[PDB]
Structure formats: C-alpha cells, structure tokens
Amino acid sequence: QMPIQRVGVRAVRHPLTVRTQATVGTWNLDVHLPADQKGTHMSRFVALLEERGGPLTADAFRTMLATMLEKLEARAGRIEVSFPYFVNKTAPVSGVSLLDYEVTLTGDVRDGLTRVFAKVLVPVTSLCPCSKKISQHNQRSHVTIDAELAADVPVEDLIRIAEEEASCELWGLLKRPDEKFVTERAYENPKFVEDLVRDVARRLDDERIVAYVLEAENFEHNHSAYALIERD
Amino acid sequence: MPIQRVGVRAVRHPLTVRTAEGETQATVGTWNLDVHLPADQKGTHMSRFVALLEERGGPLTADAFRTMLATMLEKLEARAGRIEVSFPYFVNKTAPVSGVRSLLDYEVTLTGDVRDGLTRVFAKVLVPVTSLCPCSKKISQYGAHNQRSHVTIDAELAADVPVEDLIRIAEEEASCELWGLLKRPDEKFVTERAYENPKFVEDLVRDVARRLDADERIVAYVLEAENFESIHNHSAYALIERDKRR
Amino acid sequence: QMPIQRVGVRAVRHPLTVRTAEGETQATVGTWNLDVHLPADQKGTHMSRFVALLEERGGPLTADAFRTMLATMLEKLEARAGRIEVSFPYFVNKTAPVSGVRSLLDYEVTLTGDVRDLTRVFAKVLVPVTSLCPCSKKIQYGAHNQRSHVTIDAELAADVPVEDLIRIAEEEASCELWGLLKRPDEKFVTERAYENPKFVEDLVRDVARRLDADERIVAYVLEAENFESIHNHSAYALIERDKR
Amino acid sequence: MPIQRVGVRAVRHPLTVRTAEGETQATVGTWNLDVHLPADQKGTHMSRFVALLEERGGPLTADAFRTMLATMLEKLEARAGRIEVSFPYFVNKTAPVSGVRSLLDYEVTLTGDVRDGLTRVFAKVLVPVTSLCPCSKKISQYGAHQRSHVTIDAELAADVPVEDLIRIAEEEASCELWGLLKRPDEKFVTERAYENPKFVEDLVRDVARRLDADERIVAYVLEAENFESIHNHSAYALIERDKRR
Ligand SMILES: *C[C@@H]1C(=O)O[C@@H]2[C@@H]1CCC(=C)[C@@H]1CCC(=C)[C@H]21
Numbered sequence: 001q002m003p004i005q006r007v008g009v010r011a012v013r014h015p016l017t018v019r020t021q022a023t024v025g026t027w028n029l030d031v032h033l034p035a036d037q038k039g040t041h042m043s044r045f046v047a048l049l050e051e052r053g054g055p056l057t058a059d060a061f062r063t064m065l066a067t068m069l070e071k072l073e074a075r076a077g078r079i080e081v082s083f084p085y086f087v088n089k090t091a092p093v094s095g096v097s098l099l100d101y102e103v104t105l106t107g108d109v110r111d112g113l114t115r116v117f118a119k120v121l122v123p124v125t126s127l128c129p130c131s132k133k134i135s136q137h138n139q140r141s142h143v144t145i146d147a148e149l150a151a152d153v154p155v156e157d158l159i160r161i162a163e164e165e166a167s168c169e170l171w172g173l174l175k176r177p178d179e180k181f182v183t184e185r186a187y188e189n190p191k192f193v194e195d196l197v198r199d200v201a202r203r204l205d206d207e208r209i210v211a212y213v214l215e216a217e218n219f220e221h222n223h224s225a226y227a228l229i230e231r232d
Numbered sequence: 233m234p235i236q237r238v239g240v241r242a243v244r245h246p247l248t249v250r251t252a253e254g255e256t257q258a259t260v261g262t263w264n265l266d267v268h269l270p271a272d273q274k275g276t277h278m279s280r281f282v283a284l285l286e287e288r289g290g291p292l293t294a295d296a297f298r299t300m301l302a303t304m305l306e307k308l309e310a311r312a313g314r315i316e317v318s319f320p321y322f323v324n325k326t327a328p329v330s331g332v333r334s335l336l337d338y339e340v341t342l343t344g345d346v347r348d349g350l351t352r353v354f355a356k357v358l359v360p361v362t363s364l365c366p367c368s369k370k371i372s373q374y375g376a377h378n379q380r381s382h383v384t385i386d387a388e389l390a391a392d393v394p395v396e397d398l399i400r401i402a403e404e405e406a407s408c409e410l411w412g413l414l415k416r417p418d419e420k421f422v423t424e425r426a427y428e429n430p431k432f433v434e435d436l437v438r439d440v441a442r443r444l445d446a447d448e449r450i451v452a453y454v455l456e457a458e459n460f461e462s463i464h465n466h467s468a469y470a471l472i473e474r475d476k477r478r
Numbered sequence: 479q480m481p482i483q484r485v486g487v488r489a490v491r492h493p494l495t496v497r498t499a500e501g502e503t504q505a506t507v508g509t510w511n512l513d514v515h516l517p518a519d520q521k522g523t524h525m526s527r528f529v530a531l532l533e534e535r536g537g538p539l540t541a542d543a544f545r546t547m548l549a550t551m552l553e554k555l556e557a558r559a560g561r562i563e564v565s566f567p568y569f570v571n572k573t574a575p576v577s578g579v580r581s582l583l584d585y586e587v588t589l590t591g592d593v594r595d596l597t598r599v600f601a602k603v604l605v606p607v608t609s610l611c612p613c614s615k616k617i618q619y620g621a622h623n624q625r626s627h628v629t630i631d632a633e634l635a636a637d638v639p640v641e642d643l644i645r646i647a648e649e650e651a652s653c654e655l656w657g658l659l660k661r662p663d664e665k666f667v668t669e670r671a672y673e674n675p676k677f678v679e680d681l682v683r684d685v686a687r688r689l690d691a692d693e694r695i696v697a698y699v700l701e702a703e704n705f706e707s708i709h710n711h712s713a714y715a716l717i718e719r720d721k722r
Numbered sequence: 723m724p725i726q727r728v729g730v731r732a733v734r735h736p737l738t739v740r741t742a743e744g745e746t747q748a749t750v751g752t753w754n755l756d757v758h759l760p761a762d763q764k765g766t767h768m769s770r771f772v773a774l775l776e777e778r779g780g781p782l783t784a785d786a787f788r789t790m791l792a793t794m795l796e797k798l799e800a801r802a803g804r805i806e807v808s809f810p811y812f813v814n815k816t817a818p819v820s821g822v823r824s825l826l827d828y829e830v831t832l833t834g835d836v837r838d839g840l841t842r843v844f845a846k847v848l849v850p851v852t853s854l855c856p857c858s859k860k861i862s863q864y865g866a867h868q869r870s871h872v873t874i875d876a877e878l879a880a881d882v883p884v885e886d887l888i889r890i891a892e893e894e895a896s897c898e899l900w901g902l903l904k905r906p907d908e909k910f911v912t913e914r915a916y917e918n919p920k921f922v923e924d925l926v927r928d929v930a931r932r933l934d935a936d937e938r939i940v941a942y943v944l945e946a947e948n949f950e951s952i953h954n955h956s957a958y959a960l961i962e963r964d965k966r967r
C-alpha cells in the first residue's frame with residue numbers, strides 16, 4: 001500500500017560500446033512503483049538492453065532513460081551501468097600503453113528532472129609527506145570522482161584531473177629511463193591524501209559540474225587512508 | 233577547503249558483541265574510522281584511529297558504541313565524525329521439524345555519525361531468506377520457482393534494537409527462513425510452507441516496511457531486497473526509504 | 479641459485495576481440511597473467527616486456543593465434559618456459575523456449591596456455607544453470623530449486639569451441655538459463671525443473687560422460703555448486719579424469 | 723562413476739585457534755567439508771557435514787583437526803575426504819622503535835585430507851609485507867617505488883605454528899607491516915626498507931632457502947604479489963618443491 005521508489009533488475013551483464021571502444025558493462029535498471037500498483041515488467045528492462053543499440057552517447061543515454069519510462073509505463077527510475085574504460089596515453093619521456101579505469105554512468109528520472117551523474121575510479125600514485133621530512137612510502141591510491149553533470153563531461157577529462165594532481169600518474173609500460181622521472185616526481189611533490197582531495201576538488205569546484213563526491217583511498221600498514229569531500 | 237570525512241579505512245580487529253540474551257558473541261569486525269577536518273586545519277593524527285580499536289577492551293554494546301564516538305571525537309579534537317564496523321553475526325536456530333540447533337550467518341554493520349552535535353546511530357543487517365515467485369505457482373500445473381534472497385535493513389535507531397529483532401522481522405515476513413542443518417522432515421515443512429506463502433520482491437519489502445513502521449525505535453530506515461533468480465543470471469531488486477519526521 | 483618456477487605479471491586488464499564458433503567476433507575485456515621461468519642462473523626478468531607484448535599485438539584471438547602469442551613471448555623474454563592466461567566474459571544469443579525471443583547470456587571463459595618442456599592448452603567454462611533437488615518433490619506440490627555454477631576446465635587436444643561445452647552443461651542441468659523470458663516461457667522453465675530433477679552428483683556424472691567422449695579433451699576437471707535456497711551454504715561436487 | 727570431492731561449501735561457523743604461546747584466539751572461518759563418493763552409493767548425507775561443525779568442542783589444534791577429519795569420515799561412512807577452513811589470524815606486534823602495539827591481519831587456510839589411509843595436512847598463510855625496488859633506487863637521484871602479499875602453502879610433516887611461517891616472510895622482505903606507527907617508528911621503516919630493497923624475484927628465493935631447511939615442511943607452494951604502486955598491475959612469482967622427490 002506504499003510506493004517502492006526503486007523496483008527493477010540488478011547485475012545485468014551485457015556488452016556495450018562507447019564513444020569508439022567496445023567494452024562490457026553491468027546494468028542496474030529500475031523504475032518507481034506507485035502506492036496502488038503491485039508489479040512491473042521486469043522482462044522489459046531486459047528487452048530494452050537486448051534491443052537498444054548505437055554507441056552510448058550523452059544523447060543515447062538520455063533517450064534510453066526515456067524509452068524505459070514508457071516501456072515500463074512509469075514516472076521515475078534510474079539507469080546504472082558499470083563498465084571498464086581504457087585510455088591510450090604517452091610515456092613521460094619514452095613515447096610509450098593502455099590504462100584501465102572503471103566508469104559508472106547513472107541517470108535518474110525523478111520529479112521531472114533527468115539528472116545525469118558519472119563516476120570514474122582512477123589509479124594514481126601517492127607519497128607520504130611526514131616520511132622524508134621525518135627520515136633521511138610511495139603506494140598507489142584510488143580516486144573516485146562522482147560528478148553531477150550540468151552539461152556533457154567526458155570521463156577522460158575527469159581522469160586527467162586526477163592524474164594531474166597526484167605525486168604521479170600510472171603507466172602500464174614505463175621504460176627504465178622514465179622510471180627515474182616518475183620515481184623522482186614524488187620525491188619532489190609529497191602528496192598527503194588529506195591534500196590531494198583538497199587540490200582535486202578545487203579543479204571541480206568547473207561549472208560543468210554542479211555537485212560531486214570525491215574520495216581518495218591510499219593503500220599504505222594493512223589499513224587504508226580515505227578522504228571524501230562532497231559538495232553542491 | 234574543508235574535508236567532510238578524513239580517517240582510516242579497512243582496519244580489521246577482533247570484536248566482542250553482546251546479544252539480547254546474556255550471550256556475548258566474538259566476531260571479526262572490519263572498521264572504518266573517520267572524522268571531519270575544516271579549512272583551518274590541514275592534517276589529522278591518523279595513528280589515533282588505530283589506537284582506539286587497540287586501546288578499547290570490552291563488549292561492543294549500544295552504550296559502548298556511543299562512548300566510542302565521543303572518545304574518538306575528543307581524542308582527535310573534533311566535533312564530528314563517523315564510526316562503522318562490519319562484523320559477522322550468528323544466531324542458533326531450531327530447525328522447523330527437527331528442532332536441531334544450527335547456526336546461521338548474518339552480516340551486521342554498525343554505523344554511528346555525529347554532525348552538529350547530533351549522534352545518528354544506524355544499524356544495517358543483511359538477512360538471508362527464501363523467495364518464491366507468485367506468478368509461477370498459478371501459471372504452472374506443477375511447481376514454482378524458488379531462489380535465495382538478501383534482505384538489507386539499514387535503520388536509524390531512536391532506541392536500542394536487537395540485531396536479532398531486525399532478523400526476526402524479515403525472516404517472519406518471507407516465504408521461508410534459512411536454517412543450516414535440516415533433515416527430510418525439515419526440508420518438507422520448508423518446501424511446502426514457501427509454496428503456501430509466495431511473495432514478490434515487491435511484496436517482501438512492503439510487508440517488512442510495515443513491521444518497521446510499528447517500531448518507534450526505528451525513526452528512519454532504508455529497506456532493500458535482492459532475489460538471485462533461478463531462471464536468470466540477473467537478480468531482482470526493490471528499495472524503500474523513509475524519514476518518519478517528514 | 480634456485481629455479482623460480484614462473485615469474486611475471488598478473489592482473490593486466492586489456493581489451494580483446496575473439497572470433498566465435500560462428501566466425502563472428504566478440505569484443506570483451508579480459509585480465510591477463512603473463513609469466514616466464516627464471517633458471518637457477520637468471521636472477522631477473524624485464525617485466526615491461528609482457529605489458530608491451532599485449533599492447534603491441536594485433537588480430538582477433540584464435541586457437542592458432544593464442545598458441546603463437548606464447549611463442550612470441552618466449553623470444554621477447556629470453557625464455558624456454560612461460561604461461562599466458564586470459565579470463566574474459568563471453569556471450570551467446572539464447573532464444574526463449576516458447577516465445578522465441580532472443581537474449582544474451584553471460585559466461586565467464588578462462589583460456590590457459592602453457593609452454594613448458596609440449597605446449598598444453600586448456601579451456602575453462604563457467605556455466606550458470608538452474609538446479610533442482612530431487613528430494614523436495616517426494617518429501618508433494620513443491621520443490622526446492624536454485625541457481626548453480628558448472629565449472630569445466632578442459633585440456634584441449636584439438637580445437638574445442640567453448641560453445642561445445644556450454645551446450646553439454648546446459649543440456650545436463652534441470653534447466654538452462656535465460657535473460658529475457660516472457661510469461662509463456664516462465665512456465666516451461668518452472669515445469670521441466672520439476673520434470674528433470676537432478677542432484678549435484680546426478681549432474682556432474684552426466685556432464686563428464688560426454689567430456690571423455692568428446693575425445694578432443696585430453697583431461698578435464700568439472701565442478702558444480704548449488705547455491706541452495708534453503709541454506710546459506712553451497713553444495714559441491716568435483717570429478718577429475720585424465721584417461722592418459 | 724566415482725566422484726573425488728562431493729560436499730558442503732562456504733559454511734560460516736565461529737572457531738577458536740591456538741596461538742604459539744598457548745593462548746587462544748576467536749575468529750570466524752569459512753569451512754568447506756567434502757568426501758569421496760564411490761560409484762556404489764548415489765547419495766551422501768550432506769546434512770552430517772553441518773552437524774560435524776556444530777557438534778565440535780574446543781580449539782582447532784593439530785590432533786583436534788585430525789580427530790574432526792576422522793570423526794567426519796565415520797559419520798559420513800566414507801574412505802576419503804577433505805576439510806578446509808580459512809580464518810583471519812591476528813598477532814599483537816611491537817612497533818620497531820616505540821614499542822606501541824598493533825594487531826595485524828593474516829589469512830590462514832588450513833587444509834586436511836584423508837585418502838588411502840594417509841592423512842595429509844597443509845597450511846597456507848598470506849603475509850602482508852612491503853617491497854622496494856632494487857632498480858628504481860640507484861637509477862634515480864632520489865625517491866624509491868609498494869605493499870606485497872607472500873603466500874606459503876606448506877605440506878606439514880609435523881605440527882607447525884602459522885606464526886613461524888609468518889616470521890619467514892616478514893624477515894626475508896624489505897620491511898614488515900604495522901597497524902599503529904609512531905613518528906620515530908615511521909622513519910626507520912622508510913629507510914630500512916629502502917636500505918634493503920628486494921625484488922619479487924629476490925623475495926621468493928630468499929624465503930625458500932629457510933623453507934627448504936625446515937624439515938617440518940616437506941612441500942610448499944610459495945607465491946608473491948607486489949601490487950605495483952607505479953602500475954595498475956602486479957608482479958607474480960611462484961615456487962614449487964616436494965623435497966621427497
Ligand atoms: C622495480 C622496477 C621499477 O623501476 O619499477 C618496476 C620495475 C620492476 C617491477 C615492477 C613493479 C614494474 C614492472 C615494470 C617496471 C618498470 C616496474
């Protein structure tokens with residue numbers, strides 16, 4: 001006798017192309033059920049994915065959210081997708097490699113507002129500031145940028161914002177000469193997890209992003225160091 | 233640029249937990265201790281977090297969790313922060329026909345936050361239950377489709393609530409409860425009662441939410457239910473949220 | 479001064495394109511584990527080679543192409559022994575039983591290739607299926623059923639499309655799995671499960687039977703897990719036959 | 723057809739473990755109990771498997787592990803079977819210089835197998851350690867490039883405490899791990915790990931020497947993953963050795 005804000009499918013694995021790049025994405029498609037209805041065409045959620053096509057595009061994602069709301073005869077819902085994203089970048093001096101970043105594109109239709117969010121987990125390098133000054137500790141960190149979008153924003157732009165405010169970016173292949181630069185860059189710029197977040201937010205604190213949730217996790221100890229800063 | 237959450241993550245440490253009855257259960261809790269850093273400050277004492285779990289000695293009780301939050305806040309010289317411990321819980325149960333005593337696993341998460349001098353204490357429990365699809369017993373001459381289900385109950389608490397009391401609500405409001413040890417009688421009463429009580433992922437959350445609304449000890453809750461479909465590799469999901477003050 | 483059996487990279491995730499049994503192409507993302515062997519004398523390996531080899535490659539991975547990659551590494555890494563492993567999600571167009579509506583199903587496919595003094599090639603298939611206990615029906619109107627995982631690791635003597643192992647498993651379970659199933663189709667899947675109930679042992683035995691008959695599988699290890707719906711524990715059954 | 727392993731999987735049931743000193747430790751383990759099914763009999767009694775865990779008393783010692791193993795063989799009426807449990811283990815360590823203490827998390831998988839009258843018993847430990855680069859340090863003017871996991875699955879010839887298996891990995895690495903660390907303790911770990919850089923290739927060989935010596939261990943499978951901090955992949959190394967050969 002009460003409304004179920006999210007009713008739907010979860011963990012739907014089905015291929016997906018983005019732009020071009022073919023990946024595989026896991027879907028979480030859901031709709032809101034009113035207080036008087038009792039069921040939903042969960043089969044339609046599958047039929048959508050299995051029939052939809054085209055490179056996913058800001059516009060194709062917005063249309064896919066709309067088609068769902070009709071196919072399911074609904075007024076609110078969300079389309080969530082988690083897929084691997086790669087980027088062919090160049091070495092700092094070598095000229096050479098592809099890196100894996102996990103992206104999450106989410107779009108909800110509530111109160112006549114189709115809000116498009118996007119998140120990317122980026123591998124980045126960090127170096128302790130206390131050590132070095134304390135002594136005569138360069139682990140890897142995971143930066144998560146969940147950005148509420150006011151206008152279209154590429155994921156590689158967000159990836160660039162994170163790798164550009166860190167002791168060092170990550171490269172799959174790094175010739176031995178490059179290793180020096182990457183290793184010596186941290187020695188110069190000791191980055192405290194407490195600071196990397198502050199610095200990263202400043203780049204988003206950007207108008208294509210009205211709101212965001214940015215988290216930095218360092219893999220020190222067998223524990224971890226985590227900082228999150230939300231906004232509006 | 234203030235930092236809303238700054239602390240440690242993924243600290244594992246043994247833990248003692250006290251039940252509704254005079255039973256204390258020893259578990260392993262992975263802790264995530266965090267605080268708030270304003271713009272005036274520019275760094276926190278990470279080591280202090282790790283010290284409070286080692287320093288403390290006792291059975292995590294509803295009052296011991298409160299003191300911990302404050303303790304942490306003072307030991308770091310802050311006025312806001314959060315504490316989350318994820319531990320595995322267990323309850324001895326009597327099988328439906330046998331009465332055989334078997335232990336069932338439960339995933340409990342104790343969280344507590346302080347913001348603006350207000351301490352919201354929340355409790356999430358992952359409850360394993362059985363689901364039987366309603367349009368399978370009426371669409372088919374013989375049989376029905378059954379899967380395992382995950383019922384998650386995150387609840388802001390206005391009062392102490394036993395985690396077993398949250399398990400008792402959901403297990404009662406489902407097609408059939410889970411038991412580790414069952415024999416031929418046990419597995420007969422189980423199968424038949426579930427066919428007799430078929431429910432949707434849509435129905436499950438509603439039945440539970442109503443029992444939740446009869447508990448004034450829970451001011452707010454976020455209910456969730458996943459059905460690991462037997463006929464599909466995908467799962468089904470339903471979610472309900474409620475701030476009773478609105 | 480000790481032979482390090484296999485040293486190399488692990489968890490290298492890289493995009494891959496694989497030709498199917500139909501000749502068609504399947505683009506998936508696979509995580510790679512490329513390693514080499516260090517004799518008692520050699521003390522170090524140029525780890526960077528593995529990474530390069532992956533990105534500087536080209537061509538849809540094939541039975542012949544995969545064997546070639548193992549050979550190329552052995553030269554790029556100055557080695558006589560190495561192992562290359564790729565684990566990737568794979569999909570097939572499964573058509574519904576009664577409505578004929580087609581839909582894709584997920585299958586984790588792991589491909590292992592080893593070249594140690596004889597190049598042994600393997601294939602792993604994870605078949606999700608429905609299980610039904612044969613002792614819930616006889617104990618009236620009612621059965622306990624759930625999802626199951628059939629794992630088939632097979633050493634290849636000739637080319638064997640994974641699709642040839644899925645069918646067997648899907649056919650040897652009480653019911654196969656479908657993503658898009660309409661009301662007419664959700665009744666044949668709920669009935670045949672009652673009709674063809676099967677224990678975890680009754681299942682594994684039925685599957686391994688055609689594996690030793692496939693004759694292109696030199697060896698195999700078959701697993702099956704029932705994610706029981708009446709317990710929080712999973713039923714298991716593993717059978718290992720070499721026949722060599 | 724005969725099936726080698728048939729049984730339960732992923733049963734969570736609290737357990738108590740014996741520490742070297744003799745003290746006890748409470749943990750929660752995931753038990754995987756399985757048997758060998760002959761072509762003669764179609765049905766195992768799976769239930770019993772859960773009954774054997776609930777009907778248990780006291781700490782998992784070396785004799786209690788073999789007792790359980792056997793007791794389950796008689797309750798299930800079989801001639802072969804395996805029992806595996808994986809539990810978190812903790813050790814009250816001492817910070818290098820300040821003496822502040824901290825518990826460290828270790829993953830211990832205890833395997834036991836009766837087959838053909840011979841009861842084999844194995845022990846696996848994952849030890850969280852630090853590694854540094856015997857290539858980045860010198861080649862670079864300043865700075866060093868991560869945490870690693872060392873896994874030692876050892877076939878035991880006699881009763882061996884897991885802490886002794888933990889000691890070999892923590893000592894033959896660059897540095898060990900600590901939960902709580904002071905300022906004087908964080909300066910010794912940064913230099914002494916840098917002063918003693920060891921490769922993944924160098925890490926595994928150094929441990930095996932000690933393993934090859936301990937006559938308590940007849941066979942072992944040694945693994946090492948360095949979880950690279952400059953890269954999105956990890957380094958792997960494996961050693962295999964049944965001295966009886
Ligand atoms: C240690 C040496 C280095 O400078 O960084 C490393 C390399 C060996 C091992 C490893 C962690 C990486 C693989 C390629 C490489 C350049 C990285």
Ligand SMILES: *C[C@@H]1C(=O)O[C@@H]2[C@H]1CCC(=C)[C@@H]1CCC(=C)[C@@H]21
Nearest residue numbers: 042043365367368459461468664
């Ligand atoms: C009973 C009905 C059915 O047969 O199909 C199932 C089930 C409803 C819930 C759910 C587990 C399934 C998702 C899609 C599907 C068709 C549903």
Ligand SMILES: *C[C@H]1C(=O)O[C@H]2[C@@H]1CCC(=C)[C@@H]1CCC(=C)[C@H]21
Nearest residue numbers: 419611613614704706713768769
């Ligand atoms: C036939 C099953 C039943 O009714 O309950 C049992 C039988 C075996 C299959 C099933 C998945 C489980 C595991 C163990 C158990 C007692 C349960």
Ligand SMILES: O=S([O-])[O-]
Nearest residue numbers: 220278279903908
């Ligand atoms: O490095 S700090 O967490 O002691």
Ligand SMILES: [Mn+2]
Nearest residue numbers: 128130131137
């Ligand atoms: Mn530090």
